[PDB]
Amino acid sequence: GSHSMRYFYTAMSRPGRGEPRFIAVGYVDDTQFVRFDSDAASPRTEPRAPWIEQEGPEYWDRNTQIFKTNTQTYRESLRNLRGYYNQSEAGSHIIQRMYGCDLGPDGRLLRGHDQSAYDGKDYIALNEDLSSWTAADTAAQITQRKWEAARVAEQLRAYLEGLCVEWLRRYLENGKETLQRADPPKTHVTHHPVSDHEATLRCWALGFYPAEITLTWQRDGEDQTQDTELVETRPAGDRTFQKWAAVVVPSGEEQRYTCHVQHEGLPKPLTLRWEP
């Protein structure tokens, strides 16, 4: 129902091993569609989803121009942030930026995003009002002052309310057969004895898109949140995702346990049990 576009920028310094590397990736929901790598033999914006390939030469040239300029800009930024923290030229450091727009189940802008991190720590973020900043420390306050002078928040508001939404809706239409197609999980329960009087029940969900899913185990109709092992949702490699939830049960008590699956691709939420 709801959709989003996100760009993810990563710039990493590497003293003694060349200039900092700049990588940019673009996503619509859980589907990557573009990439850029400054380390590539011939750095250029490349398609990563079939539905983006139809975009003309102007699109790709403009993307590449932007990312090539960002490569240089982020190298300067890394030099600046090193200075803000009194860090030596010897250590490796990372700046990450993620930005983009959310849409509800109708089409208009729900919320805009722009967030930055330095060495994995939140550094500066655009507030939900798309007008003000939250700076993490006195270093980020310098960045804030620069960004207020350069009208950055205003540029971001214009982009997030306008071009971001416009292009997301265009991508959603062009890639509708995949992006607006929810694939339900294929689900089953496996039984693995651990001892004479305990066994693991593992509830599988496979081949689903998007990644959003709820897998829960219940005993006598009561959630077993503390006793359930839930692995991180993982990509299958074919656009789809996988997940499982496992619970250790007393032997003979298996039928007191139910797995519940909630996903967009399903006509109705599933209730599953182990079938001997």
Binding site: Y7, A24, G26, Y59, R62, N63, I66, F67, T69, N70, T73, Y74, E76, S77, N80, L81, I95, Y99, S116, I124, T143, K146, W147, A149, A150, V152, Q155, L156, Y159, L163, C164, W167
Partner: peptide
Amino acid sequence: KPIVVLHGY
């Protein structure tokens, strides 16, 4: 489509 190159940090 990405936003234009914004000011450095």
